[PDB]
Amino acid sequence: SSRAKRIMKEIQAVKDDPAAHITLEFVSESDIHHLKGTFLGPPGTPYEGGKFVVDIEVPMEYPFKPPKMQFDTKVYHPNISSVTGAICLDILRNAWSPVITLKSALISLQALLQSPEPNDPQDAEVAQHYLRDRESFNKTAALWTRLYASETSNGQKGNVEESDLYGIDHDLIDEFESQGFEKDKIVEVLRRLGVKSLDPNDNNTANRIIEELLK
C-alpha cells in the first residue's frame, strides 16, 4: 500500500541480507496494519538468550505516529509487562521526539533488558519485589524467557515443553536398571507416569516408582 510503504522502507533495511541481527515480519493481509519485530540473540544473561516477539501495531497516520509495542516474550521487567504487556521507552507514555523510529524502540528493549532500572519504573510491585529478592527473580526470569522464547502454531492456554527431543527413556531407565530392577520394571512405571523433571536423588515420584519397581 501507499502508507504501508512508510514502514516497508524500514523493514527493507533489515531484509537487506542477514545482517544487523534484526527481524521484522508483518502479520497482516494486503493491508499491513499489525507489525511484529523480533530479535535473535545468544545467551549470557537471564534477560537475553533466545527469541523475542514484540507485537507492534502500525496505523495509517503520518502526523505523530507512535508505534505501539506490547507482550514481547511476556518478559517480566519493571518496564516490560506491567499488567497486560506494555513497555516504557520514549514513544510509550510520553515521547519527546517524533523522529524516534520503530528500530530505536526495538533496539532500546535489548539494552533495557540487560539494564536494571528500579529507580522510577512503571510497576511498583515488581520494583519492590525485585529490590528484596533479586536473586530469586533472576533465575525465574531466565527460565520464563528460555521457555517463552518461541512458540509453534497457536495455543489454547499454555503449551510449554514436550515438543523437542524427549529425554525420558534410557536416562530414567538407567537409574532403575543398574539399581537392580529390569527394563520391564521401569517401562511399567514410566509409561503410566511419564515424568520429565526427574531428579537423581531428590524426587518424590521416584520413591513411588521404585515402590512398584520391586514387583
XYZ file of C-alpha atoms in Angstrom:
215
model
C 0.000 0.000 0.000
C 0.929 3.682 -0.203
C 1.021 4.436 3.524
C 2.393 0.946 4.151
C 5.448 1.887 2.084
C 6.494 4.097 5.003
C 7.028 1.116 7.304
C 8.104 -1.184 4.469
C 11.141 1.022 3.845
C 12.206 0.490 7.458
C 11.888 -3.286 7.127
C 13.864 -3.245 3.873
C 16.989 -2.331 5.842
C 16.757 -5.461 7.989
C 15.734 -7.550 4.976
C 18.927 -6.433 3.226
C 20.722 -9.756 3.699
C 21.024 -11.455 7.135
C 22.655 -8.530 8.933
C 22.151 -6.279 11.971
C 20.649 -9.259 13.825
C 17.272 -7.583 13.303
C 13.921 -9.135 12.397
C 10.690 -7.649 11.044
C 7.757 -9.829 9.985
C 4.358 -8.228 9.393
C 1.385 -10.493 10.101
C -1.493 -8.989 8.123
C -3.268 -9.201 4.763
C -2.509 -6.838 1.868
C -3.292 -4.071 4.363
C -0.315 -4.391 6.710
C -1.636 -2.915 9.957
C -0.059 -5.141 12.608
C 3.736 -5.391 12.634
C 5.924 -7.838 14.556
C 9.615 -7.145 15.078
C 11.769 -9.852 16.645
C 15.465 -10.104 17.506
C 17.678 -13.187 17.791
C 20.449 -13.170 20.375
C 22.723 -15.689 22.169
C 22.655 -16.391 25.942
C 24.976 -14.983 28.586
C 22.338 -13.361 30.782
C 18.900 -14.121 32.337
C 17.475 -11.189 30.361
C 18.788 -12.291 26.958
C 19.209 -15.687 25.330
C 16.740 -16.774 22.675
C 13.979 -15.124 20.653
C 11.685 -12.172 21.368
C 8.375 -11.369 19.671
C 7.193 -7.783 20.136
C 3.613 -7.230 18.981
C 3.698 -3.966 17.032
C 0.694 -2.015 15.758
C 1.408 0.469 12.967
C -1.603 2.614 11.904
C -2.021 4.694 8.744
C -1.168 8.122 10.156
C 1.738 10.379 9.191
C 1.460 13.195 11.801
C 2.674 11.814 15.132
C 2.690 8.062 14.511
C 3.601 6.441 17.873
C 4.407 2.735 17.228
C 2.640 0.582 19.820
C 4.550 -2.316 21.385
C 3.430 -4.936 23.909
C 3.748 -8.558 25.023
C 7.181 -9.380 23.548
C 8.157 -12.674 25.149
C 5.947 -11.549 28.068
C 9.236 -10.552 29.718
C 8.796 -9.791 33.419
C 10.578 -6.451 33.772
C 9.703 -3.194 35.618
C 9.464 -1.657 32.143
C 8.101 -4.525 30.060
C 4.979 -6.426 31.130
C 3.226 -4.279 33.735
C -0.296 -5.711 33.605
C -1.103 -6.969 30.105
C 2.097 -6.322 28.184
C 3.407 -2.767 27.958
C 6.817 -1.098 27.744
C 8.109 2.349 28.654
C 10.531 3.777 26.098
C 10.129 7.313 24.739
C 7.160 6.563 22.460
C 5.060 4.723 25.049
C 3.877 7.033 27.830
C 5.381 10.382 26.816
C 7.583 10.611 23.723
C 9.885 13.626 23.436
C 10.739 13.269 19.747
C 8.707 12.258 16.641
C 11.921 11.076 14.964
C 12.299 8.037 17.224
C 11.721 5.377 14.565
C 10.479 1.873 15.379
C 14.012 0.489 15.105
C 15.006 2.648 18.073
C 12.163 1.291 20.205
C 13.176 -2.296 19.447
C 16.923 -1.821 19.909
C 16.160 0.066 23.123
C 14.442 -3.012 24.552
C 17.578 -5.116 24.078
C 19.776 -2.777 26.119
C 16.901 -2.175 28.534
C 16.524 -5.895 29.226
C 20.159 -6.061 30.337
C 19.852 -2.834 32.326
C 18.041 -2.866 35.720
C 16.256 0.433 36.345
C 14.167 0.025 39.540
C 14.619 3.718 40.367
C 11.426 5.116 38.840
C 9.786 2.389 36.683
C 6.098 1.791 35.970
C 5.491 -1.332 38.053
C 5.939 -0.626 41.765
C 5.121 -4.188 42.822
C 7.879 -5.582 40.605
C 10.455 -2.993 41.670
C 9.734 -3.597 45.357
C 9.771 -7.372 44.880
C 12.996 -7.294 42.864
C 14.606 -4.953 45.392
C 14.247 -7.609 48.092
C 14.512 -10.928 46.249
C 16.571 -10.099 43.161
C 18.360 -13.455 43.049
C 15.051 -15.321 43.237
C 13.567 -13.351 40.342
C 16.770 -13.514 38.295
C 16.645 -17.290 37.855
C 12.873 -17.295 37.344
C 13.301 -14.557 34.737
C 15.773 -16.545 32.636
C 13.519 -19.602 32.816
C 10.428 -17.752 31.592
C 12.294 -16.207 28.661
C 14.011 -19.520 27.922
C 10.606 -21.202 27.677
C 8.690 -18.301 26.129
C 11.497 -17.591 23.654
C 9.388 -19.041 20.839
C 6.200 -20.980 20.097
C 4.958 -23.002 17.125
C 1.347 -22.733 15.956
C -1.404 -21.234 18.113
C -2.303 -22.177 21.673
C -5.335 -22.720 23.894
C -3.990 -21.969 27.372
C -0.316 -22.847 27.697
C 1.947 -25.259 25.831
C 5.376 -25.423 27.465
C 7.961 -28.138 26.818
C 7.049 -31.519 25.332
C 7.927 -30.592 21.748
C 11.593 -31.317 21.032
C 13.609 -34.482 21.675
C 12.301 -36.094 24.863
C 14.889 -37.066 27.459
C 12.695 -39.592 29.256
C 13.667 -43.098 28.145
C 17.050 -44.660 28.883
C 18.039 -41.907 31.331
C 15.239 -42.718 33.754
C 15.682 -46.368 32.873
C 19.426 -46.430 33.530
C 18.651 -45.378 37.101
C 16.307 -48.256 37.964
C 18.135 -50.682 35.710
C 21.546 -50.527 37.390
C 19.693 -50.370 40.711
C 18.629 -53.977 40.316
C 15.298 -53.750 38.544
C 14.882 -54.841 34.932
C 13.823 -52.690 31.975
C 10.363 -54.272 32.158
C 10.108 -52.638 35.589
C 10.945 -49.073 34.546
C 8.778 -49.212 31.421
C 5.769 -50.256 33.501
C 6.328 -47.348 35.897
C 7.460 -44.837 33.268
C 4.601 -45.362 30.814
C 1.938 -44.830 33.481
C 3.614 -41.751 34.978
C 5.912 -40.293 32.334
C 7.706 -37.592 34.311
C 10.053 -35.063 32.713
C 11.643 -33.068 35.534
C 13.015 -36.073 37.424
C 15.785 -35.674 39.999
C 18.767 -38.030 40.579
C 18.357 -38.268 44.353
C 15.585 -35.799 45.183
C 12.266 -36.800 43.614
C 9.002 -37.823 45.276
C 7.737 -39.695 42.215
C 10.891 -41.813 42.285
C 10.121 -43.317 45.695
C 6.645 -44.208 44.433
C 8.177 -45.625 41.254
C 10.676 -47.908 42.967
C 7.782 -48.978 45.164
C 6.289 -50.879 42.229
C 9.702 -51.474 40.631
C 10.201 -54.267 43.185
C 7.145 -56.155 41.876
